[PDB]
């Protein structure tokens with residue numbers, strides 16, 4: 001077992017880490033840093049081609065690459081790691097044990113463009129903004145905004161854009177995603193720019209506008225990428241910035257995120273923490289635990305545990321099938337391997353039909369995968385059918401965690417195993433707890449079968465411009481399948497406290513078995529209703545839904561909209577009338 005210790009010696013700690021890690025020999029490694037501020041530039045960092053799920057594949061500059069260890073541990077001892085430019089901070093590949101603790105990750109210059117809106121003129125089609133200085137970087141060239149101008153990199157445009165409250169640093173009431181692609185930006189002095197373009201929906205005056213950049217290149221790498229690893233623990237790990245997601249896990253087992261978080265540094269002038277999901281679990285298995293954590297100010301979901309839906313392309317023989325990935329950012333994923341159990345899904349039935357076990361895998365390219373099974377393939381297997389990995393599905397538990405003030409759903413649950421969401425504080429612009437089985441555009445599996453959401457606090461939920469709800473069960477499946485079959489099952493929403501401004505509470509679609517009990521709804525938020533006459537609960541094409549011992553306080557609101565199919569099995573004790 002080797003133990004490497006480091007001090008803040010040089011202004012760029014990348015070459016020292018690269019050389020020390022390159023000469024490691026044993027399979028048990030521990031790295032200790034004396035508490036200080038370490039800076040890492042990508043200029044002299046190692047470069048490898050990487051396949052990153054829900055990110056863009058390509059050549060990556062990597063600061064910490066740890067591959068093949070029996071156990072690897074990184075002790076930061078409260079150190080702060082400052083990164084620069086387009087770089088991947090940490091990569092943990094093929095490790096039977098991973099532990100990172102007591103560390104803070106940030107960038108010297110963030111890859112965002114934040115500006116305060118001064119005035120908006122919809123008639124002429126321009127907006128006057130004052131960019132926040134802080135540690136942001138930007139300039140003008142060719143009548144176009146260039147940012148962040150780090151190591152010669154700059155996005156073509158501001159890209160997708162959102163309005164934020166300057167005081168609370170959260171998405172504004174009724175805020176929606178803007179897309180800024182302006183070609184004419186003027187400098188009026190005063191540190192004020194006039195951006196010429198006719199937006200569909202303009203940001204409010206006084207709000208702060210966030211911009212991540214071009215959609216094609218802003219997902220460079222997550223702060224942490226864990227691939228094919230087991231027994232991973234993150235303890236007291238804070239992420240202030242990342243050119244992508246915060247914690248990304250691919251095909252891993254027994255993951256723990258404790259006392260960690262992704263949020264803004266207090267006293268700073270930053271608006272966004274991570275440009276993508278805070279935590280992400282793609283086809284993991286074993287157990288996943290998130291406890292005593294805090295995720296805010298991300299540009300995407302707080303958590304998404306899900307698997308991959310692959311599409312049958314061709315039948316090779318009686319035991320071999322070739323599948324294709326559905327989403328462009330899913331190509332290169334390690335879908336399956338030997339001894340994996342796989343669910344077969346035949347059009348137009350959305351349910352898991354049969355199970356088979358993989359014998360071998362022949363990867364043709366990043367898009368197509370040839371799978372040979374131990375048993376005979378289903379006789380009805382045809383092109384367009386789906387494969388879902390049965391082995392790689394985790395149990396999920398999120399408790400005593402804070403998720404607020406960011407642009408997405410709070411928690412997205414797509415695992416068929418036992419899921420427990422308890423004792424959390426939640427606040428979401430969009431839906432808070434979302435279920436979206438997707439075979440239309442994202443191809444993310446996870447029809448659920450055991451989910452429990454109890455004793456949580458929901459405050460200021462679903463204040464986006466588009467309609468949402470605290471608990472939103474809305475699968476989006478390909479039209480090659482029937483659109484009225486039961487998809488999700490056995491979801492319980494118990495003993496929660498919802499502070500409402502007039503938002504939907506529960507919107508269920510194709511749920512089989514849904515218990516909404518013991519909840520207290522408090523109409524105590526002084527915010528205007530964005531979708532008038534929206535009911536607390538709406539159910540469509542569902543079965544065996546039960547309302548029981550719920551309480552509503554405040555101004556009256558429409559209670560229930562239900563289709564004739566789910567009404568035949570709905571149990572309503574009239575606790576809210």
Ligand SMILES: O=S(=O)(O)OC[C@H]1O[C@H](O[C@H]2[C@@H](O)[C@@H](CO)O[C@@H](O[C@@H]3[C@H](O)[C@@H](OS(=O)(=O)O)[C@@H](O)O[C@@H]3COS(=O)(=O)O)[C@@H]2OS(=O)(=O)O)[C@H](O)[C@@H](O)[C@H]1O
Pocket residue numbers: 054160177215276277300301304408409412436438442444466
């Ligand atoms: O199946 S889902 O759980 O619903 O989605 C899986 C992905 O979730 C994350 O990213 C998407 C998520 O934030 C979603 C929430 O509504 O919005 C998506 O945006 C898409 C488009 O990508 C976006 O255009 S652009 O190219 O990003 O500029 C815009 O058209 O809005 C849509 C849908 O949003 S909405 O209907 O207006 O509410 C997010 O896509 S993404 O930001 O481009 O990645 C997650 O980060 C993904 O990896 C998937 O897990």
Ligand SMILES: [Cl-]
Pocket residue numbers: 015044
């Ligand atoms: Cl060097």
Ligand SMILES: [Cl-]
Pocket residue numbers: 049050051052
């Ligand atoms: Cl790779």
Ligand SMILES: [Cl-]
Pocket residue numbers: 518519520549550551
């Ligand atoms: Cl009650």
Ligand SMILES: [Mg+2]
Pocket residue numbers: 051052053054055056057328329330331332
């Ligand atoms: Mg990718």
